[PDB]
Structure formats: structure tokens, C-alpha cells
Amino acid sequence: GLSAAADQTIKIGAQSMSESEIIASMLGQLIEHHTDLKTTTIKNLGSNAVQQQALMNGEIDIAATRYTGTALTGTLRMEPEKDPDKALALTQREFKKRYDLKWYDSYGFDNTYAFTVSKELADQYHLETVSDVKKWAPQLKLGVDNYWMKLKGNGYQDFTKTYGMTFGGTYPMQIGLVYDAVKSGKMDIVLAYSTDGRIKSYGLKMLKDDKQFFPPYDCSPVVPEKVLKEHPELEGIIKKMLGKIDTATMQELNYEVDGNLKEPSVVAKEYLEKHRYFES
Ligand SMILES: C[SH](C)CCC(=O)O
């Protein structure tokens, strides 16, 4: 019954990404900093859709990182809203209405799909925007994640319609591999994730999505209203992380895992100590 609520463990989900492991660790540590709640991390959820079902079936009590553009198209099956503020507002409204899920305001960073080349390619062919690559598309191999080609929504098929180009070859692979694939010249162009730490490190160039094909992908935690009711301290704790972690910061945190070979929990703890757990 209710008087046992404070002895329940808060299960925090992470997708198969370094960024999601870092944020799920950081939120679990902040919750334990403030309360006597135990927390655990449920790792390796494969996708937006898996995080969704784990929230609805009790497998996780908090999804640490969900992305507006992904959930708009993929969960809600709505037309992709292009304005950041409108997309967030629509997502929060529909998540509450449809699922009784609370989609919080963003941590402060967006992690968008970004068409990405070597700085050498971009400098040789004067490539700044996605529209600049149109005339070259047939002679480029595009590396993509193991998930993006199968999206009916803001996927490849609609991309080719809006930009009127088709790549010579498309090669789906684990996201973590696209950075070295483009750096080594195995791929000519990759659909990277914009908060990856290796983009800067590896000397890569993101091309502007001048036609605004992509929705925003602002990142937030998502929690069932039932969990917030039963643990009324959680909302005030979650709020402490919101709007505090910008894209540059998330890139540096990702680099600590993928480039400096640190455990996501260690990266999360050192960030919390550097910033005094968000209140000094
Ligand atoms: C963060 S978007 C670049 C792709 C990953 C996802 O949304 O699941």
C-alpha cells in the first residue's frame, strides 16, 4: 500500500546510446542525492518505440531521454511540426491526453539527425547545406543508423521527395560506427547524431538542413503521472535538471564516454560534482 511507496525502486530507462546512459545515471544520482528512493538503470532499450512500451507496461518508471521530433512522428503518428516550441508543446499535450505521461520541458539540448561529411570533402566541393549535395548525391555512399531506413514518417522516402535527391548507396549500421565510417572514407556522407562527441573531435562538418526537412529533436525525461503522484518529491528533483545542459555540454559528456573511455556513471558523477548538483 501507499505507506510502502518510499521503499519502491525507481527504474530509469536508457536507450542504446551513450547520451541516454549518461543522463539516466545523472538523474538516478540526483534522485538519490535528494531522497531515500533507490534507483536502477534499465539499459539497452532499442528505440523510441521500446521506451514507449516500457513506460506503458511498467518496465520503466522514467524514460531518461526522449526526443520530440522522434515521438511526434513515431509514437503519436502526427505530421512533423518544425518549430521547436510548437513541437514540444504539442508533444507534451498529446502525451498527457493520450497516455497520462508527463513529457517534461527539455534538459536544454537537441540531438538531431544531421547530414555529415569530412571537412576535406566539404572544403573541396564547397558544401555548406544539404541542398549543396544534390548534384553529387549519386556518387555518394550514405551511412545511416540501424533504425532510420524503416521509419515511415520523417524517413528516407520523404527526404528524397523534399530535397529531390537519392544517394548512390545507403548503408544502415549501428549509430556508433558512422563517425569512423565517414572519417576513414568508407562512407562519403553519414546521417549522424548532432550531440555525438566525435563530430568535433574527428574534424567532421554538419551540413545545414536548409529546407527544414527535420523536426526538432529537443531531449526530455518522460514519467507516468501515476509515478509522480505516488512519489510526490520526484517532480521537484526532475525540475533541477531542466534547461541546464546545452548541446555543447552534451557533446563534451558524450566525448568523455566514447572518446575518453569513461563509464557513463563516472561521467555523470563528475558532472554533478563540478556543478554542485545544480544548486550552489
Ligand atoms: C535522437 S534522434 C537523432 C535519433 C535517435 C532517437 O530519436 O531515438
Side-chain angles (χ1 to χ4, degrees), residues 111-119 122 127-130 179 190 192-196 199-200 203-209 247 251:
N111 179 5
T112 177
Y113 288 114
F115 286 100
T116 301
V117 296
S118 66
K119 201 181 164 274
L127 307 177
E128 289 295 331
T129 66
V130 176
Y179 306 96
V190 291
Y193 296 187
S194 71
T195 50
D196 200 281
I199 283 166
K200 272 173 194 171
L204 303 180
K205 170 91 103 81
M206 294 190 291
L207 296 182
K208 293 196 170 180
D209 170 26
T247 302
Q251 278 161 348

Coordinates of all heavy atoms in Angstrom, one line a residue, residues 111-119 122 127-130 179 190 192-196 199-200 203-209 247 251:
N111 N 19.3 16.8 -30.1 CA 20.1 15.8 -30.7 C 19.5 15.4 -32.0 O 18.7 14.4 -32.1 CB 20.3 14.6 -29.8 CG 21.2 13.5 -30.4 OD1 21.7 13.7 -31.5 ND2 21.3 12.3 -29.8
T112 N 19.8 16.1 -33.1 CA 19.1 16.0 -34.3 C 19.9 15.0 -35.3 O 21.2 15.0 -35.2 CB 18.7 17.3 -35.1 OG1 18.1 17.0 -36.3 CG2 20.0 18.2 -35.3
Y113 N 19.2 14.4 -36.2 CA 19.8 13.8 -37.3 C 20.5 15.0 -38.1 O 19.9 16.1 -38.2 CB 18.8 13.2 -38.3 CG 18.1 12.0 -37.8 CD1 16.7 12.0 -37.5 CD2 18.8 10.8 -37.6 CE1 16.0 10.9 -37.1 CE2 18.1 9.7 -37.2 CZ 16.7 9.7 -36.9 OH 16.1 8.6 -36.4
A114 N 21.7 14.8 -38.5 CA 22.5 15.8 -39.3 C 23.3 15.1 -40.3 O 24.1 14.2 -40.1 CB 23.4 16.6 -38.3
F115 N 23.1 15.6 -41.6 CA 24.0 15.1 -42.7 C 25.4 15.6 -42.5 O 25.6 16.8 -42.4 CB 23.4 15.5 -44.1 CG 22.2 14.7 -44.5 CD1 20.8 15.2 -44.4 CD2 22.3 13.3 -44.9 CE1 19.7 14.4 -44.7 CE2 21.2 12.6 -45.3 CZ 19.9 13.1 -45.2
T116 N 26.3 14.7 -42.5 CA 27.7 15.0 -42.0 C 28.8 14.3 -42.9 O 28.7 13.1 -43.3 CB 27.9 14.4 -40.6 OG1 26.9 15.1 -39.7 CG2 29.3 14.7 -40.1
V117 N 29.7 15.2 -43.3 CA 30.9 14.8 -44.2 C 32.2 15.2 -43.6 O 32.2 15.8 -42.6 CB 30.8 15.6 -45.6 CG1 29.5 15.1 -46.3 CG2 30.8 17.1 -45.3
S118 N 33.3 14.7 -44.1 CA 34.6 15.1 -43.7 C 34.8 16.6 -44.0 O 34.2 17.1 -45.0 CB 35.7 14.3 -44.3 OG 35.7 14.5 -45.7
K119 N 35.5 17.3 -43.2 CA 35.8 18.6 -43.5 C 36.6 18.7 -44.9 O 36.4 19.7 -45.7 CB 36.7 19.3 -42.5 CG 36.6 20.8 -42.5 CD 37.5 21.5 -41.5 CE 37.7 23.0 -41.9 NZ 38.9 23.2 -42.8
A122 N 34.0 18.7 -47.6 CA 33.2 19.9 -47.6 C 34.0 21.0 -48.2 O 33.4 21.9 -48.9 CB 32.7 20.3 -46.2
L127 N 30.7 22.5 -49.8 CA 29.5 22.0 -49.2 C 29.1 22.6 -47.9 O 30.0 22.6 -46.9 CB 29.5 20.5 -49.1 CG 30.0 19.7 -50.3 CD1 30.1 18.2 -49.9 CD2 29.1 19.9 -51.5
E128 N 28.0 23.3 -47.8 CA 27.6 24.0 -46.5 C 26.2 23.5 -46.1 O 25.9 23.3 -44.9 CB 27.5 25.5 -46.7 CG 28.9 26.1 -46.9 CD 29.7 26.0 -45.7 OE1 29.2 26.0 -44.5 OE2 31.0 26.0 -45.8
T129 N 25.3 23.2 -47.1 CA 24.0 22.9 -46.9 C 23.7 21.5 -47.5 O 24.5 21.0 -48.3 CB 23.0 23.8 -47.5 OG1 23.0 23.7 -48.9 CG2 23.1 25.3 -47.0
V130 N 22.5 20.9 -47.1 CA 22.1 19.7 -47.7 C 21.7 19.9 -49.1 O 22.0 19.1 -50.0 CB 20.9 19.1 -46.9 CG1 20.3 17.8 -47.6 CG2 21.3 18.7 -45.5
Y179 N 30.7 7.5 -37.4 CA 31.7 8.5 -37.2 C 33.0 8.1 -37.8 O 33.6 8.8 -38.6 CB 31.8 9.0 -35.7 CG 30.5 9.3 -35.2 CD1 29.7 8.3 -34.5 CD2 29.9 10.5 -35.6 CE1 28.3 8.7 -34.2 CE2 28.6 10.8 -35.3 CZ 27.8 9.9 -34.6 OH 26.5 10.2 -34.3
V190 N 27.3 10.7 -43.8 CA 26.5 9.9 -42.8 C 25.4 10.7 -42.2 O 25.6 12.0 -42.1 CB 27.4 9.3 -41.8 CG1 28.4 8.2 -42.3 CG2 28.2 10.4 -41.0
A192 N 24.4 11.6 -39.0 CA 24.9 11.5 -37.7 C 23.9 12.0 -36.7 O 22.9 12.6 -37.0 CB 26.2 12.3 -37.6
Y193 N 24.3 11.9 -35.4 CA 23.5 12.5 -34.4 C 24.3 13.7 -33.9 O 25.5 13.5 -33.5 CB 23.2 11.5 -33.2 CG 22.4 10.3 -33.5 CD1 22.0 9.5 -32.5 CD2 21.9 10.0 -34.7 CE1 21.2 8.3 -32.7 CE2 21.1 8.9 -35.0 CZ 20.8 8.0 -33.9 OH 20.0 6.9 -34.1
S194 N 23.7 14.9 -33.8 CA 24.4 16.1 -33.6 C 25.1 16.3 -32.3 O 26.0 17.1 -32.2 CB 23.4 17.3 -34.0 OG 22.5 17.4 -32.9
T195 N 24.6 15.5 -31.2 CA 25.3 15.7 -29.9 C 26.5 14.7 -29.8 O 27.1 14.7 -28.8 CB 24.4 15.4 -28.8 OG1 23.7 14.2 -29.0 CG2 23.4 16.5 -28.6
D196 N 26.8 13.8 -30.8 CA 27.9 12.9 -30.6 C 29.2 13.8 -30.5 O 29.5 14.7 -31.2 CB 28.1 12.0 -31.8 CG 28.9 10.8 -31.5 OD1 30.1 10.9 -31.5 OD2 28.3 9.8 -31.0
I199 N 32.0 14.3 -33.5 CA 31.9 15.1 -34.7 C 33.0 16.2 -34.7 O 33.8 16.3 -35.7 CB 30.5 15.8 -34.8 CG1 29.5 14.7 -35.3 CG2 30.5 16.9 -35.7 CD1 28.0 15.0 -35.1
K200 N 33.2 16.8 -33.5 CA 34.2 17.8 -33.4 C 35.6 17.2 -33.4 O 36.4 17.5 -34.2 CB 34.0 18.7 -32.1 CG 33.1 19.8 -32.3 CD 32.7 20.6 -31.0 CE 31.5 21.6 -31.4 NZ 30.8 22.2 -30.2
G203 N 37.0 16.0 -36.7 CA 37.1 17.1 -37.7 C 36.0 17.0 -38.8 O 36.3 17.2 -39.9
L204 N 34.8 16.6 -38.4 CA 33.7 16.4 -39.3 C 32.9 17.7 -39.4 O 32.9 18.6 -38.5 CB 32.8 15.2 -38.8 CG 33.5 13.9 -38.6 CD1 32.5 12.8 -38.1 CD2 34.2 13.3 -39.9
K205 N 32.1 17.8 -40.5 CA 31.3 19.0 -40.9 C 29.8 18.6 -41.0 O 29.4 17.9 -41.9 CB 31.8 19.6 -42.2 CG 30.8 20.7 -42.8 CD 31.2 22.1 -42.3 CE 31.9 22.8 -43.4 NZ 31.0 23.4 -44.5
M206 N 28.9 19.2 -40.1 CA 27.5 19.0 -40.3 C 26.9 20.0 -41.4 O 27.2 21.2 -41.3 CB 26.7 19.2 -38.9 CG 27.1 18.1 -38.0 SD 26.1 18.1 -36.5 CE 26.7 19.6 -35.7
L207 N 26.1 19.5 -42.3 CA 25.6 20.3 -43.3 C 24.2 20.8 -42.9 O 23.5 20.1 -42.3 CB 25.4 19.4 -44.6 CG 26.7 18.8 -45.2 CD1 26.3 18.0 -46.4 CD2 27.7 19.9 -45.7
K208 N 23.9 22.1 -43.2 CA 22.7 22.7 -42.7 C 21.5 22.1 -43.5 O 21.5 21.9 -44.7 CB 22.7 24.2 -43.1 CG 23.8 25.0 -42.3 CD 23.5 26.5 -42.4 CE 24.4 27.3 -41.4 NZ 24.1 28.7 -41.5
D209 N 20.4 21.8 -42.7 CA 19.2 21.3 -43.3 C 18.4 22.5 -43.7 O 17.4 22.9 -43.0 CB 18.5 20.5 -42.2 CG 17.0 20.0 -42.5 OD1 16.6 19.9 -43.7 OD2 16.3 19.8 -41.5
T247 N 23.6 21.9 -25.8 CA 24.2 20.9 -26.8 C 25.7 20.8 -26.7 O 26.2 19.7 -26.8 CB 23.7 21.3 -28.2 OG1 22.2 21.3 -28.2 CG2 24.2 20.3 -29.2
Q251 N 27.7 17.3 -25.9 CA 28.7 16.8 -26.8 C 29.9 16.4 -25.9 O 30.6 15.4 -26.2 CB 29.1 17.8 -27.9 CG 28.2 17.8 -29.0 CD 28.3 19.1 -29.9 OE1 28.9 20.0 -29.4 NE2 27.5 19.1 -31.0

